[model samples]
Target: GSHMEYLGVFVDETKEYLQNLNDTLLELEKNPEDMELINEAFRALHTLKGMAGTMGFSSMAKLCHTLENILDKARNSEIKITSDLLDKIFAGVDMITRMVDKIVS
Candidate 1:
């Protein structure tokens, strides 16, 4: 039982980051081109990546990295923050949630 205590710590912290990710994404959806929203989203994702890395969750870290890349492209103005982009990001979040469930089980 003690062997899995770290999992509990990881899950608790991950949930917090995930909540922040969800809320920031919601705001980004409402204001796709808002600088503040974009930065918040970026930071949320960056933190998620760091947390996952520390927890040794490779899949979670990779997913967050991909999201960070996409968001970076958006921030650089390489792509506009369209509705479709938001949809993809939201889908990614859903995927992450499913992964979290699987890992927890």
Candidate 2:
């Protein structure tokens, strides 16, 4: 139903998208309780996950999926957004970046 690509290229794109997502997540972190910001952050992750899956980069997609789960919990008020949690999310993004590097190299 769509174009096909190899792992290295998709890793490159995923790195960029994940980096952008990290930045957006930082903004959302600062504005922690904002629903709009939360949704925006969620949307970015969701979109990235979809693209990752479509591109056959399941590693990247899995990371994004887990990220979305955490975000969803936060959105549902099950988990409070704190600086610590924000740091953790950024850490996850960093992990994804490294994985992308692995896929690329």
Candidate 3:
């Protein structure tokens, strides 16, 4: 079966989680040492990747996939959270947000 009707569900739910992602990212940037925030963001991007991937938002999925991996690494303490990492992640989030908006029209 085609998933065209499911697109609305994707957009609505995606936007909700995207909002959560942004707020979590904001708090993460402030408290880079907060393991809980990092895990929260990782889970956030994890959902973003799968949702966009399933819906054929290839670009969004790619970005989310990459960010999700980085956050996963951060979770393992394999990577340090710094200004550079934060900026990269922040930019990704903004791009995903903009891309999702484009889908509405």
Candidate 4:
């Protein structure tokens, strides 16, 4: 009952989680100082980071790599949410959405 090889059914739920990331990512822009938002994204991203590996041989592997580069800093109480920073985070955020769509559909 718990096997990634059965990811066929899990992929849909996987994309749903990505949408959640998009929400948290958007919320982060307005509340840069909010540790909660950072943690949410960090936590969610870490989860997907594991699943994304299951979908290995796909682009999300590298996308999550760059995502951690920013979110990790935010979680550690570093980096401001300036447009310069979101530009990069959003890049991976949107990229993951598209990649998941392709993988799922």
Candidate 5:
């Protein structure tokens, strides 16, 4: 067995994780005080980043790593949630989606 054999499974699981990331982010946006939502978003991004790293998708891994850093700051209460931050996170998510689309194509 080689990497190629599990590539499709990886892509599918990544999609699911991204979906969870998006959904959790939306919830966090609506209720910034919810630590649980923040944790969910962090978990999603962490999982995505690990998967991307394992698959050698450096760009995706980098994007998720940055996103996770932001979430970590929020989790630590070092920064307050803002529309601008959400927009940046969304942009990162969009970039990863496009990268995955390229992979699937």
Candidate 6:
């Protein structure tokens, strides 16, 4: 399938997106009042989730979807940003990293 040809690009781009999410989340933790940071994280995760689903990686897609929900809630002020939320976000990224690692291996 043509999918094989794009695997390299996909992996590279996904890594870049993950890094953005990581950095953005760290900034968000420090500046909970920053709407821009929240938007950036949400966009990255949205793209990641779409890529994962297209690549047939349901687990990755699901994880990103969940993370997106949390971010969405934060953006809407439905959920207050807290250390616990940050922890969960970090864990989600870690899990996504592991999943991507498995693909590479």
Q: 1-105 in candidate 5: lDDT tens per residue?
A: 776658878888889988998888888889986888878988889999999999888988998999999988988888877889889888988888888877768
lDDT by residue for model 6 (1-105), tens: 576568877888899999998889888988987888988888988999999999888988999999999989888888877888888888988888888767667
Misplaced by over 4 Å in model 2 are 1-5
The regions of model 3 sitting more than 4 angstroms off are 1-4
Off by over 4 Å in 6: none
lDDT of 1 by residue, 14-43 (tens): 777778878988887777888777777778
TM-score of 2: 0.75
Instruction: Supply the global lDDT for candidate 5.
Output: 0.86
> What TM-score fits each model?
0.87, 0.75, 0.89, 0.79, 0.92, 0.92
- Badly placed stretches (over 4 Å) of model 4 are 1-8
Tell me which of candidates 3 and 4 scores higher on lDDT: 3
lDDT of 3 by residue, 3-101 (tens): 655766777888888899889988988889889999998998999999987777888899999999889999999998888999988888888888877
Task: Write model 2 residue lDDT over 1-105, tens digit each, in one string.
Answer: 324355656666676777777677767866899777667667767877897788677877898889888878888889977888887777777887787777546
How does candidate 3 score on lDDT?
0.87
Pairs that clash in candidate 5: none
lDDT of each: 0.81, 0.76, 0.87, 0.74, 0.86, 0.87
Model 5, runs deviating above 4 Å = none
Query: How many steric overlaps does candidate 2 have?
Result: 0
Better of 3 and 4 by TM-score: 3
Model 2: lDDT of residue 42: 75
Candidate 4, residues 1-105, lDDT tens digits: the string is 755445655567667777888898788788777788888887777777778787563467666866876788987878766788878777777777777666546
Per-candidate clash tally: 0, 0, 0, 0, 0, 0
